Amino acid sequence: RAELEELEEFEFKHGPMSLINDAMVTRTPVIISLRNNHKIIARVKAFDRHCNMVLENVKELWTEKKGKNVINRERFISKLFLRGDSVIVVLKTP
Amino acid sequence: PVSCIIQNDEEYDTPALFFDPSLNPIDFTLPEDFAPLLAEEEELILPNTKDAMSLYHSPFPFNRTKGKMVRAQDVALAKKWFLQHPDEEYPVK
Amino acid sequence: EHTIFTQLKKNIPKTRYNRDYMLSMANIPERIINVGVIGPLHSGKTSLMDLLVIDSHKRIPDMSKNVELGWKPLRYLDNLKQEIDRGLSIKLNGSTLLCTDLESKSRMINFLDAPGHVNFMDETAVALAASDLVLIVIDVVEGVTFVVEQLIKQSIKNNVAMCFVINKLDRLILDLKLPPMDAYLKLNHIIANINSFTKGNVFSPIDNNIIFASTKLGFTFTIKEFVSYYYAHSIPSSKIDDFTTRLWGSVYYHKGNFRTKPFENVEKYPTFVEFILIPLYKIFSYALSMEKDKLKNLLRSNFRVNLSQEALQYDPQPFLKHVLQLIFRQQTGLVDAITRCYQPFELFDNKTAHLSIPGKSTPEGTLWAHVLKTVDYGGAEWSLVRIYSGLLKRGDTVRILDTSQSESREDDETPSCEVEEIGLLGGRYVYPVHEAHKGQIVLIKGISSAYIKSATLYSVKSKEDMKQLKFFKPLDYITEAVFKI
Amino acid sequence: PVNPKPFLKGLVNHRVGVKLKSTEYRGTLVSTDNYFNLQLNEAEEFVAGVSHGTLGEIFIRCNNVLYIRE
Amino acid sequence: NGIPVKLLNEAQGHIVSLELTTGATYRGKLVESEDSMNVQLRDVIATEPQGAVTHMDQIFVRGSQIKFIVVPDLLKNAPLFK
Amino acid sequence: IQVAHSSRLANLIDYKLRVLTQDGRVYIGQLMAFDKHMNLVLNECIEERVPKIKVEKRVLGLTILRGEQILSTVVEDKPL
């Protein structure tokens, strides 16, 4: 099990799960696109195989809107767990 | 059924399981540490098991390790002799 | 005087499995299978049945403390007083009880015990006109004998699925004292012998056409059903299909790795000898010789089995029987190997072709049942029937025809009788039932006066069907009389 | 002869575009894995063939992917 | 192993009802079931989500797309549970 | 409505259960048996649906319910 874990870690370091890891290490502000139209601008704390995330300094962005209407809303949250199926594309703004 | 039962009475030091002179002559792997269920106990023959296997075939009194008590005259010692045949050599007497 | 029978309903042994749930299974034709058990003398057939019943029923009034404990075999099927005294089976007697396979599906099964003595081959054939599949019970010691050869030939011949039981395995360890190696050689020499007679087919422990049992000590294990308890609690779910087939037959094992290699490395025992027999002997040898301290823990640490303080004190045999049954649970190994070996689309259509006109005409369209024998259950004469179509009921008037008549095949063809009662055959007792369905064998009171020996039973509202319904043949009996008094 | 995984491997440090379960993408591929999750640089968001925004350094989750293209 | 799976297996023979993700109820004799609820059924009616009904012979359904299965109430009695 | 303070689902076997599914239907009935994948056997199951107004009601009976479609379960009442 331990060996497997190690292998996984190595893979992450090497492949497409490296960037996220790096970000986590640095703890920079990052944005995430999500299935339900939620732009999650937040500070990453945890990371795993599934791309679930523990989040601090959380700032989501969406639009409560029953047509025709145009409103842009966003809320601050202190600490927030996140599920991975939601995640479409994570990004890092320098 | 025509009992085939076999035991050799001479050497107690012959094992319990033996092939008697009388008998006709007749891609992938599992994890290590996986073994038979009783593989941990090494020997399947024990010092008593010879005798125990013998007792397992006996007339009434001996095959049981538990029982009640009888009067001394309710034990029939000579009853077993005349139920079985006399053999031959004996005189008519 | 004639028989030892239970004539009061309050005294019928209560059944744990809830009879009325069994009556539900009677409708679905694919759910039930009728299986008769055949074999040579004293192979354990009747004492095999005696396992299924005691496991099925919660309390039985005919159990003495002596037959419960071990010493004397209970024989439920040998109801007749002659059979008790004669020490033998004369007339065939079955039971109808439901039992679950290993998958936990619950099927209703009708057993028929055939008498094994050569002279009673009348009722082995009466068991091959009912049994869908048969169990053939073989002694390991006596080997496969000539009268065994003729049974498998009659079964191959009569379109009946075969499954073998090699019984009386204590008589190998306890009587002969064969070492674990010498035992497996003889399990081959039999199983290797069995295949030769069976033309164009092979049996094997792995395919679950062969069952290993000893009925005196009361255990039956199928190498599939043995693994699912213990060795399947160890290694991952995906390897079991792979493991089991790697168990029997010449493959060896070193550490974690099956290698068909000659016997190389150091130790040599085949995979069967090491993973089955040797842990079987160690069960024996320890349940006799070892202390009740050492043994009590080894059952907990390995088999996940616990002996009560009562169990700790019995006697050598009654204790050994208690250890084996507590290791090998209520018997799903037999019920499984029976279930998967019966394919009705290879058979049920061919069998009826052998019992009557091949056809097929008058599809459905009639209540059509086959009357086998007139069987004496206590104080009355019943007819043992099998239903190939339609639904019998109490009070119906049905046409009945002898098989002396069907050699021939509008008014004048008609004897008629009511079907007055229909029971389920229970051994000691008979359980009342209002109706019957396709596939299940029952007992009718009131048909008996209309025939002798075999008969055909039909009820029809259509003249077209009346023309097209096929009548059964005179039943075959494997022997001819030849002995005159 | 050409399987998908090797093609993917080959296409590292090269331009790629991805459609989703929908919006097109366009960026240079950084690296890939067995699960087909992606990491890209110079990401441009083609909203039905309209580059809405240039995000830059991004990581695409595998299950939302539709196809890869040059 | 799953007890619902076992129940389903037991229900073999019986007339089960069966709705999918689509919302298209069926009712028929359960021919065969597997660990994955890959049901086959005989003599089966088929209701559309809107309303209309259609008779059909031997439907197969893949458990993935199955929503819920109704089994007859006789199976409640015995002897799978204990 | 009142109910005990359980740890798991398994420990609260045979309790009358409200059940929500992804489609929006509400199955109510006693949990006879659970699963590794949260499939539920329900003893006396009633599907209750709401068309786009007021509760439409259907009595089903003994129901095997697939966990994929299950959203969440709530306790409707005590045993018996």
Added chain:
Amino acid sequence: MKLVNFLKKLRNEQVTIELKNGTTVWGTLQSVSPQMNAILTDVKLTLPSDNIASLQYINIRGNTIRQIILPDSLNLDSLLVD
């Protein structure tokens, strides 16, 4: 490595939970499964512009739970230790 472990460690926390269908769920996490199946107590279901519905006990499934909104005070580094 595992967030599952972290989740498990979070016990007896009065938390909001957010689903794939957007339902806001205020309750005390009594337990969570290895597969994120949340078991709440003292539960309060509200939608994202309509009235509230309260419940004593709710077992929500792991696939549904989008985002568990954590408590106010929490030492995360400590939690993250094996």
Added chain:
Amino acid sequence: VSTPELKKYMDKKILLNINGSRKVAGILRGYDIFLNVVLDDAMEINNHQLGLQTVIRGNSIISLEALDA
């Protein structure tokens, strides 16, 4: 783990009810443990055939209702 018992439906024409309220027809030629279907080709339900033989993915199948008995 277990094989989908579709040996009854082998070499018979089947209505493969498929994802997104669509349909397919055709005679059954093969399948696997994931319930992918290999079938000799037929139309998409007025009507128009595409292909000589066709392979349908496992996930996509709602139903495979038998046209022939």
Added chain:
Amino acid sequence: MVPPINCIFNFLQQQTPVTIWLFEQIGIRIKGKIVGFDEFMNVVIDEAVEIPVNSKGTPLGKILLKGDNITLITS
């Protein structure tokens, strides 16, 4: 029986006109030639062509279409 994997292999060997349908997407189809094979349904398909379905033709290059969103094959 002809397994799906075998069929795929055959198709690959051939290099024939393959027309793929998309899972949960009626309006679009793909048309090309199979180049790759995977343990899952995923493949690489060079010279592909996106098609709007009849309720014309559109430009498209070489593509691997992911196994999860496949529906139909023909070759």
Added chain:
RNA sequence: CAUCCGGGUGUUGUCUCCAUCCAUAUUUUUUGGAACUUUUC
């Protein structure tokens, strides 16, 4: 048909001695194909 030498189990009393269940994400379940907009009622 009996007598006689003996026997099991249970209840109560009394007497003696002592003593207060897998570990992990790529088609059948839990890494979702979800959401947005509109009509009728």
